């Protein structure tokens, strides 16, 4: 299946309390593998996944220099942005950046992205063609012009279409046991009565990876998708994910129906019947 | 692998 490598950067100013708080994180698919926190004691890019730890000292040194460059560059951006938006030196503001690349089943490039936000709003983003820039407003046009003059787009193209995929493919091989694993979801079923004529029946999906999952509902030998309320996929905290879609159609004796779990790995779509 | 190019100030 498809895979990707994403990098997330967040920088928050702290008027009066020194430098901004900078947090950079790295993911391969749904797995965090690196981290940097300006407030941490190490002041180094740290590993968050076994397989990345095998990289030598030269790699870590470089990632650390690079992430620190980003940190400082975002510190400058915070100051410039106050200027563009004519904001006072008081008050905290946020700068966010994200980029990465996607690859399909053939591990060949599919698309790359590189976006930048300010105070939670789009600021500048590289279009799907890796040449054009989408500039939110007038302030962003000034950035756009500066980045077009420096050919940031083609530098980013060189990275996203090349380096990003090359490393993504390296991490997938080295992290074979983890990244290419596929944990089938452990299904479940429960119900806590509350008057008989209208109780609840639960449909779980636990310890699965990757996060991508699709559990739908069909009934009386047919199918619908408008009422049932489901929760956003949540992290278990041990690498796997959880998700449930409860049955809010209690009719005394729950009529005939079952969950239709769809998830990579599971040979055939699983289906849980309810029976005491 | 962080990008080593294309990262400029706004």
């Amino acid at each position, epitope marked *: 299946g498809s895979h990707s490598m994403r990098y997330f950067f967040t920088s928050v100013s702290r008027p009066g309390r020194g*430098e901004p708080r900078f947090i950079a994180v790295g993911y391969v698919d749904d797995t965090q593998f690196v981290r940097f926190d300006s407030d941490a004691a190490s002041q180094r890019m740290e590993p968050r996944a076994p397989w990345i730890e095998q990289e030598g000292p*030269e*790699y870590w*040194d*470089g*990632e*650390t*220099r*690079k992430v*620190k*460059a*980003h940190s*400082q*560059t975002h*510190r*400058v951006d915070l100051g410039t942005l106050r200027g563009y938006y004519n904001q006072s030196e008081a008050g905290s503001h946020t700068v966010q950046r994200m980029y990465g690349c996607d690859v399909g089943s053939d591990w060949r490039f599919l698309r790359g992205y590189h976006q930048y936000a300010y105070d939670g709003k789009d600021y500048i983003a590289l279009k799907e063609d890796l040449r054009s820039w989408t500039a939110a407003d007038m302030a962003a046009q000034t950035t756009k012009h500066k980045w077009e003059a*420096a*050919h*940031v787009a083609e*530098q980013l193209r*060189a*990275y996203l279409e*090349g*380096t990003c995929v090359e*490393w993504l493919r390296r991490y997938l091989e080295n992290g074979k046991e983890t990244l290419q694993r596929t944990d089938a979801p452990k299904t479940h079923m429960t119900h806590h009565a509350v008057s008989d004529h209208e109780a609840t029946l639960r449909c779980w999906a636990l310890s699965f990876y990757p996060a991508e999952i699709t559990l739908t509902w069909q009934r009386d030998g047919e199918d619908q998708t408008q009422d049932t309320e489901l929760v956003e996929t949540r992290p278990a905290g041990d690498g796997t994910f959880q998700k449930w879609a409860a049955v809010v159609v209690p009719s005394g004796q729950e009529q005939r129906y079952t969950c239709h779990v769809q998830h990579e790995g599971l040979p055939k779509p699983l289906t849980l019947r309810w029976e005491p | *692998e*962080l*990008a*080593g*190019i*294309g*990262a*400029l*100030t706004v």
Partner: T-cell receptor
Amino acid sequence: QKEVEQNSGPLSVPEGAIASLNCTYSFLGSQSFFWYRQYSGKSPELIMFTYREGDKEDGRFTAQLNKASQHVSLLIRDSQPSDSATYLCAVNDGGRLTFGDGTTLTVKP
Amino acid sequence: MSQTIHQWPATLVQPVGSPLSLECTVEGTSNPNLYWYRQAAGRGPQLLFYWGPFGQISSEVPQNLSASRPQDRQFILSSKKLLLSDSGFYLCAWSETGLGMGGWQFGEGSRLTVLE
């Protein structure tokens, strides 16, 4: 293990001929490459840089980058005596430049 | 309005045990990355310090030397007591703020000879 290797020279090339300078780097994650020219007693001057595979021409100078073999080249067309100097190959291994020890070229008039 | 970089002094001849002070000044950009390199005869420049606009980023710890950046565009290298091994060609350099292709130019360098 040498991070950036370059034959030392002196390399001789007849005036008018093409001079080719080669470089090999060991750091897989290097994303930009540079060539500097250095005359005796002077600081290095940036000749050119590149960040993508292929060739890049600027006047008589052509830089070449092959990532599969981590090799970087520089060609000087129509060599002149004033091209005599030491050419340094520099790799960017993360926010900084790492240099080779350079190749000393002598173009004979 | 373009970029330039300059360092001072150009040549120095000092005895072992004396203090060292080299200056670097850039114009044409703001918030640049500043670098100090040292070059030995026959070899290429070796990184001593790499500073971003807000502080040192390099993790190297060159013996008997230290750097400082009193202003955005003024970079200083110094030593309190030079060692024979401190002879060399001190090169200063800058790069546009961030991670990019702009800049990467050296100053004219400072040649230092320490004598017993």
